[PDB]
Every structure is written in C-alpha cells, then in structure tokens.
Amino acid sequence: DFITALPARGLDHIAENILSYLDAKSLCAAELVCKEWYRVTSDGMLWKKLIERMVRTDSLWRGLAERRGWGQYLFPPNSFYRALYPKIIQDIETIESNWRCGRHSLQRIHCRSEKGVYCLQYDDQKIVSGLRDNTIKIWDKNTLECKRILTGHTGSVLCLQYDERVIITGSSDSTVRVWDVNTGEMLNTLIHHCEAVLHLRFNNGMMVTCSKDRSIAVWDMASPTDITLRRVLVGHRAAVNVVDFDDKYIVSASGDRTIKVWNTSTCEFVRTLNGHKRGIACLQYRDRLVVSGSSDNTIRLWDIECGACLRVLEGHEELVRCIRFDNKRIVSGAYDGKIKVWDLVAALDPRAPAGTLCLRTLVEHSGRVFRLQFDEFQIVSSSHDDTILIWDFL
Amino acid sequence: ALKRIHKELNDLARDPPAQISAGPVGDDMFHWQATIMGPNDSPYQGGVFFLTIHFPTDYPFKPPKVAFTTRIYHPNINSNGSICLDILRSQWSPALTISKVLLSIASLLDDPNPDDPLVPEIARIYKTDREKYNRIAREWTQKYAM
Amino acid sequence: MQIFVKTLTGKTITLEVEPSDTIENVKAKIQDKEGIPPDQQRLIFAGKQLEDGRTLSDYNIQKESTLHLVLRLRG
C-alpha cells in the first residue's frame, strides 16, 4: 500500500506527486478508495492543481475561465474546486452543444447607429475595422462604443492587421500605412505599389503585401519607422487577392484560378495548387493546412506538402467571400448571408461522408459578409449593411 | 516612351524648381512620387503634400495620372486625392512637362476655382465664409502635412 | 532691372523690365520675345499666380529672380 506507506514515513509530497498524475475520473476513483487516500487528495489540493493544469494546457478552458470568471480563484476551502470541476465540464458541454445547435445573442453596435467594413480584427479589448470612408474605426469589445477614429488614408482602407505595437493598413490608394496602436500617430507610409493594395500579413518582423497590380512585395520590418523592401515576387497573371505566410512557405491566391506556394527562405517557387474553377477570394494557411474559398461556391482543403485536393465543400449559393478556421471548425461566409459552420476533424478524415460535414447554416442577416473572425466563444462578422454582428455562443 | 521621361528626370536633377521635387519610386521609371510645399502666406504654410504620378505608355501624347496622397482641404480635391486640372483631362499638351504640371497644381493650391468645383460642401463655405475656411484648411494641414 | 523667365520649350530667357511696368506689359514682352498670346499665359512666382492687373512691385520681385510660364487652367 503505497499511498498509505509513503505518507506514514513523512513522504506526503511523494504520495501527492503519485496522485497528481491521475485524470478526472481516475482521481475521483482514488478519492473513493479509502479515508487516507481521500485525506491525501484533499490536503494536497489535488483538484485545484488539476484545474490549474487543464487551464495551462487548454485554450477552451482558459477562455472559459476568463469569460465566466471562475478563473479569478486560480493560480477557497478546497471543496469549491472539487465541486466546480463538474460545473466547468457542464459549461463546456453546453458551449459545444449550442455551437452545433445554433444559439446566439447578436449584440449590435452602440454608436450613432449609422458602414461597409472590409476587414476586421478583434481581441478582448477592442475591435479594429477598416471602413470604406477612408477611415479606421476602433470600437470597445465590452461596451461596443466607438472609441477612436483614425483618418489619413486617401482611398478606402481595404486590409489591416495589428499587434501590440502598431496597426498596418493597406488601402485602395496603393499605399501601406503604419500607425501606432496606442496613440494613433501615423508612423510611416510605404509607396511602392502601382495599384490598390488588396491584402497584407506580417509577423516576426517580416511582412508580405499583395496588390491589384498582380505583384507581391516582401518587406523587412526593423522598426515601425524602418521598413525596407526585400524582394518583389512576380509570376501571377491576375490580381493577387489574398496572401498568407509562415516560416516555411508563402501562399498566394489570385484571380487566375491558381494557388502559388513559394519558399520563405529565398522566395523559391515550390508548388502550384490548381483545381479551382474561378478566382479565389479568401484563404487561410496554418499548421501545414490550406483552406481556400473561391468564386466557384466551393471550399477546397489541401495539404501544403502534396497539394492534393483532400476535400471540396459544396452548398454555397454565392461566392465564398471569406473563410476562417481553427483546430476544430471552419466558418465560412459567402455573398448571400449564410454563415456555414463545418467540422474540421471530420473533414481531415477521408472516410467521413460529405453530407456529414456541413454542421450548420446560420442565417440571420443577408448582406455580403465581407469579414468574419471567430474563436472558441464568438464570431464577429461585417457585411455591407449591419455594421458589426457579434455571434456569441455562451 | 522612356527617353522623354529620362530627359525630364535629368532636367529635374539639373534645374530644380522652387517648391517642387519629383523622383522615381523604385525601378519602375513610370511611377514617380512628387512633393508640393505649401506656398507661403496661405493656410497651407509650412506643409508638405505628397503626390503620386503614374505615366501612361504614350505619355508624351497622353496626360499622366496625378493624384494626391495626403488628405487636403480644397474645392478642387476630393477625399480620394483626385485632381481636376483641365490641363490633365482634355486640354493636355505635349509641351507641358512634370515640372510644369506640379507647378500648376501648386499655383492652384493658392487660387482655387470655386466656379464648377469638385467638392461643393467646401466651395460653398469658401464663397460664403472666406474666414472659417482659412482655419479649417490650416487645421487639416497641421494634422496631415506637418 | 532684369528678370528671368522659363518658357514651355525648356529654353530660358531674360527680360529687361523695371519695377514700374504692369504685369500686362510683362506678358506682352514675353509674347513678343517668344510668340505665345497672353490669353494662354500664366505667370507663377514662388508658387503663386501673377494677376494681370498689377505691377511687379506688388509681388516683391527683385532682380535676377526667376518666373515660370505655364498654360491656362481652371476648375
């Protein structure tokens, strides 16, 4: 009898270490073994440590702890945790169930209640959106009040991306502007493209931009005011609509019905994914997986290594404008107001049937959803009308 | 039409005007970026307005597209930074060169043409309150040009 | 005194004028020395239009200065 001999000789920490390697069910089973085992689990805050470990290794649990509020007590009679764990599991189950059932709140925007957002990005504090009136609006994530307005772009602000220090936007006036996310003073202006900039991405000090001029430009960002063009990628015969990248490859989707994969190392043409009947409007590349939404009303999933069409998704009655995905689902938005939520785990499996992939079709609005970003708890979208829609699932 | 453009650049690099400066962006000799310094004794005092010039294939016989890059307050310039010089739309002449078009725009910066304007919401205030306009344009200049 | 004016043809010329002549006289001299009617003439100095009904002294134009000649424009 280890659990009883170990603490008998003063090795309580060893016994607790032994019990810490158990899961939820095994832990309750051990708690129901004997009085001494129960005393060890109680005295050692075994349940609390279990919840802490879960929060440390799972995003869903983390998000729930920060949104629901019970995370405040993490990192207290030791009974609150043992009784809280079942409630947390219950909440997670309710979350996934309503995700597959279609429940929401649809919190509207609280400002003058007046439109035309082309790109949107949010966090837990603000919502940055690139309007069509040549301005950038920053809203509050909690009160939804229009916090600030950044002006200075000559044309319409098409795309944008920000981090904890700057806000890089690409407008229709063929210019890229670097703003200060804290204060809002225009820190830099890049004049290198001959036509409207359609998309841009940046991370780890490097950036990539694609404009209607059928060209791609990579930039080395040494500071918000020190950006230098490194190379000019050519090869596309049409307007490059979307461009994404990582440390391995850079994917470019243009209106020429093809996908191009170049090597980030020295901009080397690696592969070319073909199969789309029309131009590609949106795409996301991550974890060596590419998901593209084109004009053929279908969503194509591919493996960056082989470039094989793992699966084509049908059902969209219009052009798939934007699409996003995570480790669990794939949320897509086409012209007709129809937010289609698909399962990713079931899609990556070649044995699943096509009919069992489309989870739900949320239809509450009708305008062309231009942008939509989601996480494990909500979906923020923007279309022609209906300035901003928040799809909360809790 | 590359020889003419090269000669124009040579002239700009030899006899530069008072408040005009235009140079190529990168390797594309057909895409230049110019600058216009706000003329003195005007609401645009001490301001630098960036432009963007794009030369067509038959530039010597076709006006080049010129567009403002920094927002401004003027009855002949909308928010999109589009300019309405009749010498740029139909009355273009092969004699006019970049150093001339930029100077013409600079002159237009001071003397606006309220008659047949591009932004009525501004031309109205100009023809009615020539005082408030002097303050609004100044504020915008301090917000973008400066 | 004397002033310098740059014509549309790229070439440069100079005119012998005093601070008493009117702008109309200046344009007339530019016409006879070049061959362009005054209706299609516009004088710019320090980025400012030169009104016809005035005189060089009204704009504080010293000798050896430079004037740019451009075509006519409108709204």
């Binding site: 082309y118 790109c119 098409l158 359609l198 998309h199 404008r321 231009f370 022609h384 | 009749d86 047949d116 | -």
Partner: peptide, 9 residues
C-alpha cells in the same frame, strides 16, 4: 472641373 458590388478587395 466638374465630376470628370463595391468590393475593391
């Protein structure tokens, strides 16, 4: 001078 799907991207 006088005058002379909204998805640019």
């Amino acid at each position: 001078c006088k005058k002379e799907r909204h998805d640019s991207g």
